């Protein structure tokens, strides 16, 4: 899921 991927990445990026 594109949305799921973005969400995880966002938090990871900090």
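-> sequence recovered:
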């Amino acid at each position: 899921g594109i949305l799921d991927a973005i969400k995880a990445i966002a938090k990871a990026a900090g």
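The helical segments are 2-13.
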